[PDB]
Design a protein around this nucleic acid. Structure first.
Length: 1105
RNA sequence: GCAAGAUCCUGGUAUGCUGGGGAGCCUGAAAAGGCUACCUAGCAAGACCCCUUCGUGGGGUCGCAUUCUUCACCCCCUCGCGCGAGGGGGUU
DNA sequence: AGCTTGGTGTATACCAGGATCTTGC
DNA sequence: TACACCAAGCT
């Protein structure tokens, strides 16, 4: 049922938002906007302070779980070892706290004479060492741990500091001895510091390492006269550690042979493959042409790089030695860094590096492993390559040789060269078998060997393949849903155009750096701007600000000449002229004195001058290096040294710095990933052209096509000067997608060039046939956008998180409160009962027919009964019997014999009861703990419809009216809301506004509000769908930094956010015509009751099933 | 040649929270309370598998990602002649 | 009494490396 | 951060 029409797909990708569009076309002019929508996503971010994604949090949790499991396993193994040695470990309870430290001190300074006492103290010490073994590099083997200096430098400096502090000395200076003596002398001391808290100095300031614990164990065993065998056994058992292993299903399959997994660089196959490649890439001149070298010479130079144990031969020692040529300047096509004095020739040519390193180490340890020498020299080369591949990649979870541990230990710690080439071992062997004989190159060998075409390329990823990047995966999922829906509606797109603006391969730390840079921008220049306005300057120009910042930092100092100068004498000079590859940046400038100004003469700066009098080098940069960071100025310490080093690099250059290149239109991992997936979609489906642009382009297109978001969506001017910012509304992303749909690479290049020329300062109109064709073929886009916005079709949506996964409870466990049965019980005390069975028994006690609990918190509901005996399933509670209580009157669950608060709410089942004229509404706020304790985090259950038992924290803390209504039974569930649902009230808007809500709606009459949380049992938190909260936050930071800068409407908007509309449910859900809109991928409200979340009206929503 | 950085992944560490203990200090001194440490067990709820010790308890992996859960249709891939497990899409 | 208002607690740090891709003249 | 909870103000 898909009707094919001509249309193009415009995609604007941002940092938290993706804009999408589908514009029909007739004759290269936009005919009709089929669908437009802006999608807001979290970027996969689960933790807001750090910005770490949900995938990272899951990985950290799983890693901590595995750590604890392995720690338990190895501690049990140590307990078994201590049982075998007859040493009693440290008991759990009834033990002095300092017994472990006292035992370690006594064992490490004195020799115990009593046998059973010695064994007991040794067990205590060994258990306490294995529980607190310290830190060690995980890759290091136990042997490599033992090779470390004993004791470590860190513990040595800790010893020296503590000697200078406590003025005591104890031989040997172990951590156990001194910590035990501290615990005896000064109790309450901290052995290791804590980040958060009053001024006390701890015992050890630097984290203790595993080698210090090993050294103390060795000292203890030596002074007690223990045999070296049990010393080795307890060292192995205490410091047991799983090997860091890269798991399978993580290394990519070979594109040529997907069944066979890829191969490392250390494989001898790749070694000789790279040798043959380096030989063959040399275009030997022959007959005044680039003829290939002969087969005899090719074989000679191929073999010549396989019999060197070191880096002996070099690149310059190939042409005149083995290539058999009489001149060294006949060689071209070298893939090296071009440079004078034969820079690409002196460096060493690649060889068999794995064999070289292996043979070098073998010659160094001929005595230790002669069997490996035999198996390495007198064994066939294919099995040698197999064994090299085995030894190169043994650091993977999932050794076919089955040797005793003693022989392979000298080889297990030996690491072959790292890295991972793009080809597998089987594929490389098959290629190199049919490469050294036919005398062909890499391309021909690949084309011929596996029967692939000349145009055959490694397959592009499909739209259903996850990229592994959080932001890119979010944008890609939204894009693939939009594109699939658009394809099934109006056929394949005629073309696809995509633009992404920053926010790629950047991490919150990049966001912090950019915000610090702009804060420095707008704060450092204010001093000079005030100085100029006091002087009386009325010409605000950025170049003036830059030169005056240079004046403030440098005190107007021509350093090459002297000659003190002032504001009237600056003469802004460029280190690199615009004619030799220069740009008006903040690093190319230099303060000049007239004499030190025109002496450059287009020559490289500080290059023609240094070989002359009155001006010299080697001393100016000596002062640039010592330029200490000024604490109040633009170039902050995170970038001051960067700017210093960039200036130093630009100062000493003797040739030009190429070149005046523009953006290369593709640099990001997100860019290449999205382009490859869209190209794969087009090749599979039939898209003519796919382009992925940068910037910084659609802004210029909107500027030159006369598109204004403020005029389009009727948005007031938040700023006192000019109009509202481009980012104030959220539909501007979809507007940019619509405008992107028109763009083509040529007109995009022209617009980008015009922007680059303009910002180097007016205004200059672009002039090209392509630009004119675009402009007069897109004059009706303004009318189309006006008609679309006035129809209220451009939507802003957020995808739903419906999967019941995440943290089930708050991470902090809490102590149970405790309460007697036969006392006076309040409603809050009834609600804090931990055990469900006694909870239901008390519910029956207050009222036998009551399925739930309906009590006010502070209301007294139970007197003190001296005969109150409660019958249970397996026990009875006397009047004096005690009952566990949750510590606070909020949602909590029982985990590991403690109390944990419930996490954020997954959803909130909407309950509506009463008359049809005006029914009441209440929310049953449900978190993950409520589904967990109800046994619902399983397969084949509907987490939005399956009921929760009354003892759950959700039903415990429901509103009293809801509890009574559902107790009567008339309260049914009409629907559910999740954080991110939008509320579409209708044309009228919000009729129940009051106070600051009314003041906000005075300027912003939104009809679309997004459910952003459920703060208590009677209220729902809503935010406006079409407004950007980040813009409100930057308004806040501007008004709190700069006063008298915003419009009254801007102040009102900034005051509304970020709490927004903390809205009572009874006032929100009572609006007639309210719709909870679940949009499709295209941005259209879904209304068919299919197998996907559909829109519903709370006033007329029907009961389930 | 041209390093990085980002995304994770694997293995560790210290603190902390809860439960059990106590070295010191402070109250009550009639008795059991607090504080700073330190010791010890656990650190998502749990699911599945191996058991024989058929029950009594011990071992192995998975469990906070893929934002429309579950159900339902379609598509791709894998163990696999039907279909168990991974993904993807679903127009208003 | 039933709304609106503001202020706040929340488990936090580290480490050392393995793939993957890009950079850039 | 930012959301669920907990102190209120006050009309």
């Amino acid at each position: 049922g898909t009707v094919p029409v001509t249309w193009r797909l415009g995609v604007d990708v941002g940092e938290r938002s993706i804009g999408l569009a589908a514009v029909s076309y007739e004759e290269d002019k936009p005919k009709e906007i089929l669908a437009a929508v802006s999608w807001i996503h979290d970027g996969g971010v689960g933790d807001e302070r750090s910005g770490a994604s949900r995938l990272a949090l899951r990985g950290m949790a799983r890693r901590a779980r595995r750590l604890r499991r392995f720690r338990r396993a190895r501690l049990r193994d140590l307990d078994m070892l201590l049982s075998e040695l007859g040493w009693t470990p440290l008991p759990d309870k009834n033990v002095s706290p300092v017994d472990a430290w006292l035992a370690r001190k006594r064992l490490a300074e004195e020799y115990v004479v009593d046998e059973t006492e010695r064994r007991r103290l040794l067990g205590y010490a060994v258990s306490h060492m294995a529980r607190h073994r310290g830190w060690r590099n995980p890759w290091t083997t136990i042997k490599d741990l033992k090779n470390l200096p004993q004791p470590s430098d860190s513990w040595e400096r800790t010893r020296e500091s503590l000697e200078a502090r406590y003025s005591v000395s104890l031989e040997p200076g172990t951590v156990g001895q001194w910590a035990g003596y501290l615990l005896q002398r000064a109790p309450g001391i901290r052995l290791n510091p804590t980040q958060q808290s009053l001024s006390n100095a701890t015992a050890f300031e630097t984290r203790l390492r595993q080698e210090d614990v090993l050294w103390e164990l060795r000292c203890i065993a030596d002074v007690q006269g223990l045999p070296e065998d049990v010393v080795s056994n307890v060292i192995d058992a205490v410091f047991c550690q799983k090997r860091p292993s890269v798991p399978a299903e993580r290394i990519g399959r070979d594109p040529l042979d997907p069944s066979q997994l890829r191969a490392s660089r250390a494989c001898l196959e790749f070694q000789e493959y790279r040798i043959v490649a380096a030989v063959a890439n040399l275009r030997i001149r022959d007959g005044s042409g680039s003829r290939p070298l002969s087969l005899e010479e090719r074989n000679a130079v191929i073999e010549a790089l396989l019999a060197q144990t070191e880096r002996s031969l070099t690149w310059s020692d190939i042409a005149l030695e083995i290539l058999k040529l009489p001149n060294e300047s006949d060689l071209t096509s070298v893939p090296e860094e071009d440079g004078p004095s034969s820079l690409a020739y002196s460096q060493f040519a690649p060889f068999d590096e794995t064999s070289a390193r292996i043979a070098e180490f073998i010659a160094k340890n001929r005595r230790k492993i002669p069997t490996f020498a035999q198996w390495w020299q007198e064994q066939d080369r294919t099995s040698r390559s197999d064994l090299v591949a085995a030894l190169a990649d043994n650091s993977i979870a999932g050794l076919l040789v089955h040797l005793p541990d003693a022989e392979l230990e000298a080889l297990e710690g030996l690491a072959l060269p790292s890295g991972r080439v793009a080809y597998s071992r089987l594929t490389l062997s098959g290629l190199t078998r049919v490469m050294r004989d036919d005398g062909v190159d890499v391309h021909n060998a690949r084309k011929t060997c596996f029967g692939v075409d000349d145009n055959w390329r490694p397959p592009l990823p499909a739209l259903h393949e996850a990229t592994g990047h959080p932001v890119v995966d979010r944008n890609l999922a939204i894009l693939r849903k939009f594109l699939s829906s658009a394809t099934m509606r109006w056929g394949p797109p005629q073309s696809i155009v995509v633009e992404l603006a920053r926010g790629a391969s950047e991490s919150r730390e990049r966001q912090a750096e950019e915000e610090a840079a702009r804060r420095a921008h707008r704060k450092a220049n204010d001093r000079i701007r005030a100085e100029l306005r006091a002087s009386g300057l009325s010409d605000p120009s950025p170049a003036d600000l830059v030169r005056a910042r240079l004046l403030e930092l440098y005190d107007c100092h021509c350093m090459y000449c002297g000659a003190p100068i002032s504001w009237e004498n600056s003469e802004l000079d460029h280190i690199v002229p615009r004619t030799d590859g220069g740009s008006n940046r903040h690093e190319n400038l230099a303060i000049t004195c007239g004499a030190c100004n025109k002496e450059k003469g287009r020559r490289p700066f500080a290059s023609w001058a240094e070989t002359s009098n009155r001006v010299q080098l080697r001393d100016v940069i000596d002062r640039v290096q010592k330029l200490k960071y000024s604490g109040n100025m633009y170039w902050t310490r995170d970038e001051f040294s960067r700017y210093k080093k960039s200036v130093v690099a630009r100062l000493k250059r003797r040739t030009s710095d190429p070149e005046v290149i523009q953006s290369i239109e593709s640099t990001g991992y997100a860019a290449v990933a999205l382009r490859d997936r869209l190209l794969s979609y087009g090749e599979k489906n039939g898209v003519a052209q796919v382009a992925v642009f940068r910037g910084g382009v659609t802004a210029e297109a909107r500027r030159w096509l006369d598109i204004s978001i403020e005029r389009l969506f009727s948005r007031v001017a938040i700023f006192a000067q000019s109009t509202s910012t481009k980012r104030l509304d959220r539909r501007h992303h979809a507007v940019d997608a619509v405008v992107l749909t028109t763009l083509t690479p040529g007109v995009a290049k022209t617009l980008a060039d015009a922007r680059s020329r303009r910002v180097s300062a007016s205004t200059e109109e672009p002039q090209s046939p392509a630009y004119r064709q675009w402009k007069e073929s897109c004059s009706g886009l303004g009318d189309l956008l006006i008609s679309t916005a006035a129809r209220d079709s451009i939507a802003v949506a957020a995808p739903l998180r419906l999967r019941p996964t995440g943290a089930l409870h708050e991470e902090t466990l809490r102590a149970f409160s405790e309460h007697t049965v036969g006392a006076a019980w309040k409603g809050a005390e009834l609600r804090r009962i931990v055990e469900p069975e006694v909870y239901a028994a008390f519910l029956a006690l207050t009222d036998p027919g009551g399925r739930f609990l309906k009590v006010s918190p502070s209301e007294d509901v139970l007197p003190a009964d001296e005969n109150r005996h409660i019958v249970l399933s397996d026990r009875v509670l006397g009047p004096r019997d005690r009952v566990k209580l949750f510590p606070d009157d909020r949602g909590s669950i029982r985990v590991r014999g403690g109390a944990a608060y419930i996490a954020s709410f997954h959803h909130a089942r909407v309950f509506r009861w009463g008359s049809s004229h005006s029914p009441s509404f209440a929310l049953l706020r449900v978190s993950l703990a409520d589904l967990a304790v109800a046994g619902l985090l399983r397969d084949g259950v509907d987490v939005f419809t399956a009921e929760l038992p009354p003892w759950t924290p959700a039903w415990r803390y429901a509103s009293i009216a809801l509890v009574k209504a559902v107790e009567s039974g008339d309260a049914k569930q009409v629907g559910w809301l999740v954080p991110g649902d939008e509320l579409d009230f209708g044309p009228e808007g919000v009729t129940t506004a009051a106070g600051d809500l009314s003041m906000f709606l005075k300027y912003f009459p939104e009809r679309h509000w997004v459910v952003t949380g459920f703060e208590d049992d009677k209220r729902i938190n809503l935010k406006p769908a079409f407004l950007s909260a980040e813009q409100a936050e930057v308004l806040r930071t501007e008004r709190s930094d700069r006063p008298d800068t915003l419009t009254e409407a801007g102040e009102i908007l900034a005051q509304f956010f970020p709490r927004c509309w903390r809205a009572t449910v009874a006032k929100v859900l009572c609006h007639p015509g309210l719709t909870v809109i679940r949009r499709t991928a295209l941005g259209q409200p879904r209304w068919r009751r299919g197998h996907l979340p559909y829109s519903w009206r709370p006033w007329s929503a029907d009961p389930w099933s």
